Amino acid sequence: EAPNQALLRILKETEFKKIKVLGSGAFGTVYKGLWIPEGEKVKIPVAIKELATSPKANKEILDEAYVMASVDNPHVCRLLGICLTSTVQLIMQLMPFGCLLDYVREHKDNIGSQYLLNWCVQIAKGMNYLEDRRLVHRDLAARNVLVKTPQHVKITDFGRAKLVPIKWMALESILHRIYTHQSDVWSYGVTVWELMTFGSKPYDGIPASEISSILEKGERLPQPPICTIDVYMIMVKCWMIDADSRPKFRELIIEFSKMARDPQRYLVIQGDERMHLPSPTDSNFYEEDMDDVVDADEYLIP
Numbered sequence: 001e002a003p004n005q006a007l008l009r010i011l012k013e014t015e016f017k018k019i020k021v022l023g024s025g026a027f028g029t030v031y032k033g034l035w036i037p038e039g040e041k042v043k044i045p046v047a048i049k050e051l052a053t054s055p056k057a058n059k060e061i062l063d064e065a066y067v068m069a070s071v072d073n074p075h076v077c078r079l080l081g082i083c084l085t086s087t088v089q090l091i092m093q094l095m096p097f098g099c100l101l102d103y104v105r106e107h108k109d110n111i112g113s114q115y116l117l118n119w120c121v122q123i124a125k126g127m128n129y130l131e132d133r134r135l136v137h138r139d140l141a142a143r144n145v146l147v148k149t150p151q152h153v154k155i156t157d158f159g160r161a162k163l164v165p166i167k168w169m170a171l172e173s174i175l176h177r178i179y180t181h182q183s184d185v186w187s188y189g190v191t192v193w194e195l196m197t198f199g200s201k202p203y204d205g206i207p208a209s210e211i212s213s214i215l216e217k218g219e220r221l222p223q224p225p226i227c228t229i230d231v232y233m234i235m236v237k238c239w240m241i242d243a244d245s246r247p248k249f250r251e252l253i254i255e256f257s258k259m260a261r262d263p264q265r266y267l268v269i270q271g272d273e274r275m276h277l278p279s280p281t282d283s284n285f286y287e288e289d290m291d292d293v294v295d296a297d298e299y300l301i302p
């Protein structure tokens, strides 16, 4: 197929500064930082990811670097560069509001129908882009959707992306290790469920070994209280046995866009519209010299 002419930017250790740890886990360790390149007079807020110097960890992270450097869409996370230390770290855009899963849990009392429906549109757009680029994510979940601003989300974690999260997986994946754009659609359905429930754990308490049997019997995730039959019916279509019967991401963009034009017809939330989340038009929305600070989305290169 087509040659991948993406550029892999090697960044000097001296070009950036680690400020603090943002999070640790199975995924590794992610740090908050500032990237001050050459004599550019720019300060880019960044996130630095790394998993002992084991040859396997460097191999797996460089595989993620490959995919992350190959993507370029507003609703997908691109790699800014890599730093060749003993560990080898990924330099990415700082998403100041963290993952969407923690955001929906921590801000439920201020999340309205407009915000929820727009997130669904944005995830579908990012996902449709990955389909256009012939990439199968294989790990779409609310934990892998990061928040740049409450009005702007992006898909990340390309560590499993190809050209075990059982509770997010399509039945074909669990039983036969079959991954397609239509298996990502199933994971999209589960991600939407996580959002509408304000971060509930799918099939909470049920062990992963039971899931396969539960789905085979015809059991699916329940209808969230805020969801109209209109929104739940979409989620249900994402969880059909026949992958080709599931909607396409381009159809999910359309469906949720129509709904995002009249959000109170499709999501019933007590105290809707009166709710408000931070905006780039808010006071103190943007710790150091805020002079010369440029977001990665505005710091471009040929």
Ligand SMILES: CC(C)n1cnc2cnc(Nc3ccnc(-c4cnn(S(=O)(=O)C5CC5)c4)n3)cc21
Pocket: 022, 023, 024, 027, 028, 030, 047, 049, 077, 078, 092, 093, 094, 095, 096, 097, 098, 099, 143, 144, 146, 156, 157, 158
């Ligand atoms: C711990 C992590 C979720 N986190 C917390 N506050 C953050 C602020 N900004 C980013 N920035 C990016 C940008 C693009 N990709 C990532 C990225 C890729 N993989 N991961 S992960 O493995 O931490 C993911 C599973 C939670 C994050 N982070 C990541 C942040």
